[PDB]
Amino acid sequence: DYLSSLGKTQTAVVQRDADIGVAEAERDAGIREAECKKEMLDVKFMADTKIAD
Amino acid sequence: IEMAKAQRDYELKKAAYDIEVNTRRAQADLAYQLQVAKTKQQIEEQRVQVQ
Numbered sequence: 001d002y003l004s005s006l007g008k009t010q011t012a013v014v015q016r017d018a019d020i021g022v023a024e025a026e027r028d029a030g031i032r033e034a035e036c037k038k039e040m041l042d043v044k045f046m047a048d049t050k051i052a053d
Numbered sequence: 054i055e056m057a058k059a060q061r062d063y064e065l066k067k068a069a070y071d072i073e074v075n076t077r078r079a080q081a082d083l084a085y086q087l088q089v090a091k092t093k094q095q096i097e098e099q100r101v102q103v104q
């Protein structure tokens with residue numbers, strides 16, 4: 001397995017880039033989704049406070 | 054963090070309002086007993102006048 005070993009050098013480089021990209025995308029999705037959840041909870045709790053009053 | 058901010062802002066006011074509603078409900082429950090005793094005063098005042 002000469003050639004198969006030789007392919008190992010870059011068979012993971014593209015996997016490296018793909019993992020980096022998917023990690024960045026998931027990070028952005030998570031951050032902005034958390035922001036949305038925060039805003040909607042704040043408004044919902046304000047409405048519930050008025051209901052309680 | 055802001056989740057807990059909102060949780061405090063809601064829970065503290067809910068408890069503060071609950072204090073007032075519980076006090077008023079406690080007064081309302083025993084108003085009946087207070088009045089029934091106050092009128093049982095006269096009930097007994099006459100139930101002994103017959104004697």
